[PDB]
Write a protein that binds this ligand. Structure first.
Ligand SMILES: Nc1ncnc2c1ncn2[C@@H]1O[C@H](COP(=O)(O)OP(=O)(O)O)[C@@H](O)[C@H]1O
Ligand SMILES: Nc1ncnc2c1ncn2[C@@H]1O[C@H](COP(=O)(O)OP(=O)(O)O)[C@@H](O)[C@H]1O
Ligand code: BEF
Ligand code: BEF
Ligand SMILES: [Mg+2]
Ligand SMILES: [Mg+2]
Lengths: 417, 417
RNA sequence: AUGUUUUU
């Protein structure tokens, strides 16, 4: 008796099971209400019920166990967590809790937690003694997260160009700067697919705030990982809540020496949401940005770091420029002094239908020698010195024509000499 | 005895009928008052009266049935809908209701609804069980909505250029960016005529907010569809109300697997209206735009989506640029990074009296391979690569001179090779 | 109202 197991079951089988259990007509009923009635009827027989979810401690002291399939939205099937157990096990926002639950009695509206069985997918004896995320020693990117497929596919050209322009390692904090209508969607899809193919052990999390739902359901059915999104039909409060829950879960996972990867596509939208939810202080800067509005996105971005004791946190955010709004322009670069990695995309190259439209000149990675060998770094330096004199479109055409001849970049580097 | 039937009748015949029924002199009376008196006299004999309209639920709990011929304006002949029936049939704003009505008794001012016969042009048993619009899975444009006439007319050149620049499919969410005095009116008229000619099965709705009455009555007598407009003589409150009613009706139609097409021509004017009706919060951004003013137009724009279960919602809005106001430059923009189709028009080409004055270079459609075949996409790519080096005016002249030689674009593509 | 917008 698990909550996620009943959530994954279809509607027809749940209706059939409820009709066999002998309850009210479930055809004219919601799936969540059907599951609730089935759990009630199964607990009336004396059997136990189990559930799971991410903890969201409220300001009063209690909390609930949000579900991932609903993008951490307030649902009727949330498991109530008393503050006594929180104080007894030192629980915090983001801790994954899995234990026995019971249906609400007369006068209650949510399931109660009796005994916790597993904390953060581990024993509670290992979670009671742990080092906080704020005390971990940061470090630079040491492990190399190669994005090249290696299967010789035609779509691998984007990953090869990305590796030649800006290699990505564990704990990297980069930025994907690109004007609208440049190809950010396809680039993010390719990055997510390459991460899921090359490094399936890492925890991939794609955050899409204030996006077109069709794109949400497309990304959810395309990438092999977790997708937490919030369409534009929701207020900025839900955006802030989702961002906080995601970053808290990422911190709790990193605290257990896990490799978390966050592919953010709405850093600008997140900053707009934070500027909308912040109370007015009577002081407005140039472009309509509050003085204390960028602090929360600043911390959300800076949360990414590489841990020496174990694990890492990678955050790749895509910033929006040339959107016609001065607020986004002020945000983007305020954040430019940030992202230890900038991958610029050119609109002029995208208009020529030359995919990918990557600005190789302005791209780059700091401390790239820690992720590449000596000969590889020398070859990349020679390639950059050869590409720099040529124009952007000409350099992109040259790179595409030279990478189409071979499958691996090593052969291209060997033929360049 | 139908309301719309009496509304379509002329004034002279209604006056004659009222004089034959033996009532007060109807020559010095309004047509609506004449219809009201005729309905009263006909109901005094014991016969039944029927009406219809779009439901507009008020904040208190009751509602009225607005009429389409009055642009959903508050009229004396609105049918009152009690909240009891709303609670009994789960009615919402936008549901088309058609049932028996009765004249108001002593102390009443509006017609009452006794029994509902048809809901959303369908049986109530099919409307009681339905999936909300917020739960439908979005998708990209799959079905091709070809705009080419095919009759070899001289006006078909605009549709041919539009198809070669940006093909339109079901569920598309585009933008027509053009400075003033460019030819937006003729272009919108041609688009509406091509939609009514090629795809007469789709529900066409043209929304004109804050425009001149002459243009309104011109569009109403030119296109073959529904025209809901609101001239500048009305406050922004009526603009917001009309936009809400139109989008709610569109959502209710899409919920019944219908293909709705909305040709918006005032996205900038709608954003200005929303910025005017929003209460001041003491925080003004660059250009005079409120922080929470663009949220409602953002949702109105993002409502457009393609449904996998059935139906679609297409919204083609025309944004205004270079109007001398910085608010529109932020308002029209901020919207640039939202849609997935931009059809730019050049003022320099319009000054040369070269119609249509379309910027073929900056135009385009994302995921265009889902609406065109392989050979068609290759021919469009070759045409774009040939047109790109030439200047805007030169490319437009070349395209016009090459399309004037033949009737179909297939012959042009075959002759280009 | 200052900042924002004006504004480069
Ligand atoms: N690698 C690519 N190959 C082919 N087309 C692409 C590629 N990247 C982008 N595009 C085209 O650009 C359009 C928009 O790209 P997108 O990633 O949505 O840009 P952004 O996210 O910056 O708005 C897509 O619909 C696609 O047709
Ligand atoms: N396809 C066309 N053919 C001929 N003249 C046109 C065409 N499109 C626009 N025009 C001219 O431009 C004028 C204004 O066009 P309009 O569509 O009103 O531009 P906008 O809507 O951008 O203000 C029209 O009065 C018309 O004379
Ligand atoms: F319009 Be893109 F997604 F920035
Ligand atoms: F003056 Be146009 F209608 F934009
Ligand atoms: Mg995008
Ligand atoms: Mg116009």
């Amino acid at each position: 008796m698990n909550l996620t197991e009943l959530k994954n079951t279809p509607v027809s089988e749940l209706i059939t099971l409820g009709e066999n259990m002998g309850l009210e007509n479930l055809a004219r009923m919601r799936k969540q209400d059907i599951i609730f009635a089935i759990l009630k009827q199964h607990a009336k027989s004396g059997e136990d019920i189990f559930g799971d979810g991410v903890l969201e401690i409220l300001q009063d002291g209690f909390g609930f166990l949000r579900s991932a399939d609903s993008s951490y939205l307030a649902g009727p099937d949330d498991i109530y967590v008393s503050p006594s157990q929180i104080r007894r096990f030192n629980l915090r926002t983001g801790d994954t809790i899995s234990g026995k639950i019971r249906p609400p009695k007369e006068g209650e509206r949510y399931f109660a937690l009796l005994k916790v069985n597993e904390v953060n997918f581990d024993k509670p004896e290992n979670a009671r003694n742990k080092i906080l995320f704020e005390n971990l020693t940061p470090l630079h990117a040491n492990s190399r997260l190669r994005m090249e497929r290696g299967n010789g596919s035609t779509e691998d050209l984007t990953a090869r160009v990305l590796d030649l322009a800006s290699p990505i390692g564990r704990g990297q904090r980069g930025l994907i700067v690109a004007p609208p209508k440049a190809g950010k969607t396809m680039l993010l899809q390719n990055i997510a697919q390459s991460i899921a193919y090359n490094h399936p052990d890492c925890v991939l999390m794609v955050l899409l705030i204030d996006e077109r739902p069709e794109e949400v359901t497309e990304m959810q059915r395309l990438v092999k990982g977790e997708v937490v999104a919030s369409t534009f039909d929701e207020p900025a409060s839900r955006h802030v809540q989702v961002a906080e829950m995601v970053i808290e879960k990422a911190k709790r996972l990193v605290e257990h020496k896990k490799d978390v990867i966050i592919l953010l596509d709405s850093i600008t939208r997140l900053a707009r949401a934070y500027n909308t939810v912040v109370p007015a202080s009577g002081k407005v800067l140039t472009g309509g940005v509050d003085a204390n509005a960028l602090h929360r996105p600043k911390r959300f971005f800076g949360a990414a770091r590489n841990v020496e004791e174990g694990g890492s946190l990678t955050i790749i955010a895509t910033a929006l420029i040339d959107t016609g709004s001065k607020m986004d322009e002020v945000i983007y670069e305020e954040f430019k002094g940030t992202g230890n990695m900038e991958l610029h995309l050119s609109r002029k190259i995208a208009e020529k239908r030359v995919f990918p439209a990557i600005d190789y000149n302005r791209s780059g990675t700091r401390k790239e020698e820690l992720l590449t060998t000596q000969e590889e770094l020398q070859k990349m330096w020679i390639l950059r010195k050869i590409i720099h004199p040529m124009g952007e479109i000409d350099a992109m055409e040259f790179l595409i024509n030279k990478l189409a001849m071979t499958k691996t970049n090593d052969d291209f580097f060997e033929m360049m000499k």
